Amino acid sequence: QCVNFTNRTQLPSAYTNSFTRGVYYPDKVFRSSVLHSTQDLFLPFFSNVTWFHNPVLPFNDGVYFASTEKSNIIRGWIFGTTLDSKTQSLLIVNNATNVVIKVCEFQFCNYPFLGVYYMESEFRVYSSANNCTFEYVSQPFLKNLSEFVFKNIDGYFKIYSKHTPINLVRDLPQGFSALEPLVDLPIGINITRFQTLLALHRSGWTAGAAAYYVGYLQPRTFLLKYNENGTITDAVDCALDPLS
Amino acid sequence: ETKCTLKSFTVEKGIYQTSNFRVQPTESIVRFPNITNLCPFGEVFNATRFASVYAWNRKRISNCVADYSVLYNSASFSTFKCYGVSPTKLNDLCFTNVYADSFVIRGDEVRQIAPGQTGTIADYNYKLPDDFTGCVIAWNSNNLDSKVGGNYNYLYRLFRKSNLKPFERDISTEIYQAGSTPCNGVKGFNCYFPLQSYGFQPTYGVGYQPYRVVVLSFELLHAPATVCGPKKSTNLVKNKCVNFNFNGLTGTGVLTESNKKFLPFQQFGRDIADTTDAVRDPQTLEILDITPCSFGGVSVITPGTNTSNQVAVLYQGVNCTEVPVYSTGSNVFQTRAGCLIGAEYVNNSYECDIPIGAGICASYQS
Amino acid sequence: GGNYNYLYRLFRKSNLKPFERDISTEIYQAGSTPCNGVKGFNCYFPLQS
Ligand SMILES: *[C@@H]1O[C@H](CO)[C@@H](O[C@@H]2O[C@H](CO)[C@@H](O)[C@H](O)[C@H]2NC(C)=O)[C@H](O)[C@H]1NC(C)=O
Ligand SMILES: *[C@@H]1O[C@H](CO)[C@@H](O[C@@H]2O[C@H](CO)[C@@H](O)[C@H](O)[C@H]2NC(C)=O)[C@H](O)[C@H]1NC(C)=O
Ligand SMILES: *[C@@H]1O[C@H](CO)[C@@H](O[C@@H]2O[C@H](CO)[C@@H](O)[C@H](O)[C@H]2NC(C)=O)[C@H](O)[C@H]1NC(C)=O
Ligand SMILES: *[C@@H]1O[C@H](CO)[C@@H](O[C@@H]2O[C@H](CO)[C@@H](O)[C@H](O)[C@H]2NC(C)=O)[C@H](O)[C@H]1NC(C)=O
Ligand SMILES: *[C@@H]1O[C@H](CO)[C@@H](O[C@@H]2O[C@H](CO)[C@@H](O)[C@H](O)[C@H]2NC(C)=O)[C@H](O)[C@H]1NC(C)=O
Ligand SMILES: *[C@@H]1O[C@H](CO)[C@@H](O)[C@H](O)[C@H]1NC(C)=O
Ligand SMILES: *[C@@H]1O[C@H](CO)[C@@H](O)[C@H](O)[C@H]1NC(C)=O
Ligand SMILES: *[C@@H]1O[C@H](CO)[C@@H](O)[C@H](O)[C@H]1NC(C)=O
Ligand SMILES: *[C@@H]1O[C@H](CO)[C@@H](O)[C@H](O)[C@H]1NC(C)=O
Ligand SMILES: *[C@@H]1O[C@H](CO)[C@@H](O)[C@H](O)[C@H]1NC(C)=O
Ligand SMILES: *[C@@H]1O[C@H](CO)[C@@H](O)[C@H](O)[C@H]1NC(C)=O
């Protein structure tokens, strides 16, 4: 089950403002009504984030992935370097029952996708796999705004997530919401590029309204405010302008 | 003590500081996660059947807790030899992943399974590196594998042109060509089948009976280590200055109940200047509070050597509940500066001679 | 034929203090089961030639 297509899926990748989103808890400590300055990898304030209406995208240090999700179309993720059996690969799927994480050497198709049959049962993302190393099954992740942060430090893969009810039409809202840690994985891969998995309706494929936002991280110093309950309520980027 | 610190045989009227004291810890407590996800050793050491020696069964072990204590303490193992590390210290040090090689060989072929060994199995069936690290366990299986009619299910290689590299398996059934006459896959004058089947029987003596052997190897890849023994834990105590090792975080103090509200993903809090203030016990998931058990300096009030030889003792900023020959002494008094012993409190009001603090001071009358 | 007069200790309960001498030739219990002064499983003579 590996066929190409004819309609070259090309999307108008525009640019937009990053605003003040993408702040996550860096450590597992508790602090009450304090101001703590920390140096780490973050998304710089008022940056330039790419909007997509499935091209290959570099991973760099880390990736911020946001989706104004409606009807949970986005399903999976693919990470790796050579994207084949030559090198280790990471694969993430999210069906209606569980999230599945695989660390193995697959042979991905040119246009991998989940596919649904119209009681959904279809899986043709890759062709062959062997020497599969790490496996994981957990609770499913998914009109809402879903933000995810993916990092890889010291042979450890960190995934942070947050969901927010939103009502704005088009762009990212002007507000603040900290990101809580979701999962850690003690695995070693040299991830440098990543993809996105789309859920097309196989009954002809009809999946075009897949719009999301992608941004990159950089190292810098932030100042975080902890309220009495230990929830981050505000942040300041130190290296932005003289006032900051 | 005052004379020793002041280095004189006479002491004038006043108050002096001699030394300090602190409450000593009583006992130690360790608390670790609830312990689960044991490595599946039962399916290997108690398997229904074992693979042949030239086709030894290889198993991968990663991401689990492995209890070597039960294996070491089991008396059903005839041979238990650990070369790289001591069997006792297995539960302490650990690595990233383990390989288990299981097979069945003869009783007399046991010592071939060691670094720097030679033999039919040691060269054409299973090769071990000289720098091999791990353990080898061998036990009897005569009651099961041996058959009265002869168990021919186990085969082994004898003829091969070259030896085997360490941790290499060869299962090819090519007809060996000992002589110079080529064979088109047929035995004959100088062509023989490299595989021979064992004839294990219950009537066979010691050294001929089937022997089940499992070799454990621990590999050292740069990936983080995940597989080793359970971490010993113990019950907790409260309201006693003790030293604790909560999930690798070590500290000395007294533990009390706290009403702080964490979030479901933190593990331990702090207040300022990187000072830990509250911890969460892994086994119960309860928020506790840590307070450094009391300490402070001591002081002596004396009216001068030339006047008398009785002194009063003041412990600074210490609640008069854990003072300890001066455990009782005279009527013990409590001041905002600490606890004072050896002197009596009165309701009068005089001038101040030897200042003490918090607005009160003492003098000589007792 | 080999000099077997020189023997060295290999098993002990703990380390040696500086300039300490130990000469007791007692069996060593290498396992949970006590040896009770009898050589056997998890019981080895600490001196090797
Ligand atoms: C899965 O792992 C095995 C074991 O490492 C790989 O087998 C090796 O394949 C290479 C191919 O060039 C050979 O040169 C080696 O001799 C093989 N070693 C063994 C022990 O069989 C296998 O290739 C891996 N799978 C994939 C798709 O790469
Ligand atoms: C911080 O935690 C406190 C403690 O629960 C929260 O106070 C409660 O909040 C709920 C939600 O509105 C109310 O129903 C309760 O009546 C509150 N109780 C008290 C004693 O205040 C508080 O809302 C949390 N957040 C902040 C910003 O303080
Ligand atoms: C293989 O099976 C034997 C037989 O049950 C196990 O030996 C028993 O282990 C239990 C542990 O729960 C002890 O309580 C028994 O006293 C043991 N009996 C005997 C006769 O040894 C052995 O532990 C099993 N090994 C593995 C790796 O699963
Ligand atoms: C940790 O394992 C222990 C082993 O049973 C459990 O902790 C308590 O178990 C008893 C009986 O099973 C329950 O009545 C208690 O409510 C348990 N305590 C807690 C805090 O849950 C339990 O299986 C495990 N508990 C945790 C928190 O992991
Ligand atoms: C010294 O410690 C004792 C107990 O350790 C304190 O007595 C407690 O005082 C508080 C408040 O005064 C009461 O709520 C408790 O009920 C008391 N407990 C006992 C057992 O008496 C005592 O107050 C401390 N000393 C000082 C000067 O505060
Ligand atoms: C991103 O950059 C482009 C040109 O580099 C610019 O036109 C666009 O306004 C930027 N987006 C912002 C500042 O949000
Ligand atoms: C989701 O995937 C898991 C593992 O891939 C599978 O066990 C489960 O049955 C799947 N659920 C559905 C509804 O297909
Ligand atoms: C949006 O997120 C909220 C918060 O978890 C959840 O209650 C709600 O069901 C979500 N709605 C959708 C459509 O995903
Ligand atoms: C990543 O690449 C470096 C150098 O290219 C190499 O040393 C390391 O072993 C690689 N690790 C993984 C997990 O691919
Ligand atoms: C101590 O007092 C006595 C009388 O009060 C006096 O004679 C003596 O000199 C005093 N000691 C010293 C060292 O001055
Ligand atoms: C001082 O007076 C108070 C109040 O009359 C009394 O409680 C206390 O016992 C008196 N102290 C002494 C040493 O008599």
Side-chain angles (χ1 to χ4, degrees):
Chain A
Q1 292 178 357
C2 199
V3 294
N4 212 4
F5 54 88
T6 308
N7 171 42
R8 305 306 304 283
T9 176
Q10 189 51 256
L11 312 173
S13 68
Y15 290 164
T16 177
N17 221 28
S18 158
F19 283 104
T20 57
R21 306 205 64 79
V23 166
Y24 57 87
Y25 293 89
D27 44 8
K28 306 272 196 66
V29 302
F30 171 84
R31 291 187 196 95
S32 83
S33 314
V34 75
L35 279 76
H36 189 242
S37 70
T38 176
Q39 156 60 258
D40 214 3
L41 271 66
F42 292 93
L43 175 75
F45 272 7
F46 294 109
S47 181
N48 214 339
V49 64
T50 315
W51 175 33
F52 282 83
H53 285 91
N54 293 321
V56 178
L57 303 174
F59 187 69
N60 264 338
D61 304 340
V63 162
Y64 167 85
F65 185 100
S67 291
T68 61
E69 194 50 50
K70 282 86 179 173
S71 78
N72 50 56
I73 298 309
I74 314 290
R75 293 288 90 199
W77 281 269
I78 299 178
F79 292 72
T81 75
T82 68
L83 279 299
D84 53 3
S85 293
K86 301 293 188 292
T87 315
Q88 318 303 114
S89 176
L90 194 146
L91 179 140
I92 295 170
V93 187
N94 184 2
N95 67 5
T97 57
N98 292 114
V99 294
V100 171
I101 297 89
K102 298 290 294 295
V103 178
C104 183
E105 298 79 1
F106 309 88
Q107 288 305 74
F108 299 112
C109 283
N110 294 115
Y111 185 66
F113 62 90
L114 176 66
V116 293
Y117 279 159
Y118 286 159
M119 51 66 78
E120 323 282 338
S121 61
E122 185 174 5
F123 174 110
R124 62 182 295 165
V125 178
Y126 70 98
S127 64
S128 76
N130 54 358
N131 294 326
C132 290
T133 299
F134 183 79
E135 286 79 12
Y136 200 102
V137 167
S138 182
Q139 181 181 3
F141 288 166
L142 297 94
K143 281 286 295 296
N144 268 357
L145 188 44
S146 288
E147 290 173 277
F148 296 81
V149 169
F150 312 101
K151 300 210 306 194
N152 175 279
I153 296 169
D154 291 331
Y156 266 77
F157 200 82
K158 272 79 72 177
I159 294 189
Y160 307 156
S161 69
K162 155 71 87 167
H163 312 294
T164 299
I166 201 61
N167 217 34
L168 193 148
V169 184
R170 176 259 179 273
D171 61 298
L172 285 158
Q174 272 203 318
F176 199 46
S177 284
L179 262 64
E180 309 166 354
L182 183 73
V183 65
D184 190 356
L185 274 78
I187 60 174
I189 297 89
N190 267 332
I191 292 164
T192 45
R193 301 146 57 203
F194 88 100
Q195 303 302 111
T196 314
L197 291 192
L198 183 63
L200 58 84
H201 291 170
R202 180 62 69 195
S203 75
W205 60 274
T206 311
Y212 52 93
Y213 313 80
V214 174
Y216 286 69
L217 306 166
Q218 283 150 55
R220 51 190 47 238
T221 64
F222 274 51
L223 183 81
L224 303 175
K225 154 184 287 175
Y226 292 77
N227 68 338
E228 60 190 3
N229 296 340
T231 59
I232 294 185
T233 72
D234 204 356
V236 169
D237 186 1
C238 298
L240 183 71
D241 61 357
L243 190 49
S244 298
Chain B
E1 285 176 79
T2 300
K3 280 172 189 180
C4 281
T5 58
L6 186 62
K7 285 193 189 300
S8 169
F9 273 55
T10 185
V11 168
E12 47 272 19
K13 154 184 181 176
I15 173 170
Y16 308 93
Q17 178 177 0
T18 72
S19 55
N20 312 288
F21 85 101
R22 43 194 80 89
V23 190
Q24 283 311 306
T26 312
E27 83 263 23
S28 76
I29 49 167
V30 292
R31 289 221 97 181
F32 276 114
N34 217 349
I35 291 184
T36 176
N37 192 0
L38 61 84
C39 300
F41 286 125
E43 61 166 54
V44 181
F45 269 70
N46 274 336
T48 302
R49 62 162 320 287
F50 273 11
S52 180
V53 54
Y54 75 100
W56 39 265
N57 214 1
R58 163 154 268 189
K59 183 62 181 293
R60 181 67 189 285
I61 300 299
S62 65
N63 203 47
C64 54
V65 58
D67 183 74
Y68 293 99
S69 83
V70 57
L71 321 180
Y72 182 76
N73 299 344
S74 187
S76 298
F77 297 145
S78 302
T79 285
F80 191 104
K81 290 184 180 181
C82 292
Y83 305 142
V85 293
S86 70
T88 57
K89 300 289 94 175
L90 294 174
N91 290 292
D92 299 331
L93 61 83
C94 52
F95 294 99
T96 177
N97 63 6
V98 185
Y99 289 112
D101 302 63
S102 54
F103 48 86
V104 168
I105 54 175
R106 214 162 51 74
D108 293 330
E109 310 196 310
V110 170
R111 74 280 191 190
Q112 289 195 10
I113 313 300
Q117 292 279 329
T118 59
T120 55
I121 303 292
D123 291 329
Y124 297 141
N125 291 265
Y126 196 84
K127 177 65 186 183
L128 272 178
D130 289 332
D131 59 84
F132 160 73
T133 178
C135 300
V136 175
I137 311 160
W139 63 94
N140 285 316
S141 65
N142 181 39
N143 52 3
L144 294 166
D145 287 288
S146 71
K147 195 178 182 72
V148 62
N151 198 359
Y152 274 140
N153 293 312
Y154 290 109
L155 283 85
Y156 65 101
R157 190 182 311 274
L158 291 173
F159 293 99
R160 187 174 140 135
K161 293 186 286 185
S162 299
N163 285 22
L164 273 297
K165 273 82 176 176
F167 305 121
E168 182 183 4
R169 178 208 277 97
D170 195 4
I171 60 170
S172 174
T173 63
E174 177 190 359
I175 301 299
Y176 187 69
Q177 184 204 302
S180 86
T181 63
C183 302
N184 61 6
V186 297
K187 62 165 69 42
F189 176 58
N190 275 327
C191 281
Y192 295 99
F193 205 64
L195 300 172
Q196 311 295 122
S197 56
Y198 274 123
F200 297 132
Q201 278 168 64
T203 57
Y204 274 33
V206 178
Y208 274 10
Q209 281 164 7
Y211 268 65
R212 285 179 177 202
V213 178
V214 168
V215 181
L216 282 192
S217 167
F218 313 137
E219 190 276 331
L220 284 73
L221 195 145
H222 282 346
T226 72
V227 184
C228 45
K231 300 289 95 176
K232 276 318 284 162
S233 315
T234 186
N235 46 3
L236 74 164
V237 291
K238 290 191 266 192
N239 312 102
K240 280 170 48 60
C241 165
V242 298
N243 48 3
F244 45 80
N245 194 355
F246 277 102
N247 207 339
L249 162 67
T250 64
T252 287
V254 63
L255 283 77
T256 63
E257 179 65 29
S258 56
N259 53 356
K260 310 165 99 59
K261 309 304 297 305
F262 275 3
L263 284 180
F265 62 94
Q266 287 100 17
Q267 292 309 316
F268 63 98
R270 51 186 54 180
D271 53 351
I272 206 160
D274 199 76
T275 59
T276 48
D277 266 14
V279 293
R280 159 177 289 182
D281 48 354
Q283 293 180 356
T284 307
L285 271 75
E286 182 63 30
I287 302 100
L288 277 72
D289 199 298
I290 288 164
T291 291
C293 49
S294 65
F295 62 85
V298 307
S299 303
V300 294
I301 294 93
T302 174
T305 304
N306 209 19
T307 293
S308 178
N309 293 114
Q310 38 187 348
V311 298
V313 169
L314 189 147
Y315 300 90
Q316 289 182 313
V318 164
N319 186 1
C320 182
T321 304
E322 53 273 13
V323 176
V325 74
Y326 287 97
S327 69
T328 317
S330 170
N331 58 329
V332 185
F333 190 66
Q334 166 83 43
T335 67
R336 265 179 42 78
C339 65
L340 189 144
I341 58 191
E344 195 200 351
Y345 180 79
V346 311
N347 270 321
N348 290 2
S349 52
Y350 296 100
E351 302 294 328
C352 200
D353 293 332
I354 313 180
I356 280 173
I360 62 170
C361 55
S363 180
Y364 183 74
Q365 200 78 348
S366 180
Chain C
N3 274 113
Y4 295 88
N5 296 318
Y6 315 95
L7 289 81
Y8 63 94
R9 191 93 72 83
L10 199 148
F11 296 77
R12 211 184 182 260
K13 204 151 301 303
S14 72
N15 315 317
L16 268 184
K17 298 293 183 182
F19 290 129
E20 194 155 54
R21 194 159 189 171
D22 203 349
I23 208 176
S24 68
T25 65
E26 191 175 1
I27 207 64
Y28 189 45
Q29 175 209 348
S32 54
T33 299
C35 310
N36 319 317
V38 179
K39 190 266 182 182
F41 182 76
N42 302 127
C43 313
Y44 293 99
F45 207 50
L47 273 79
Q48 281 68 57
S49 160

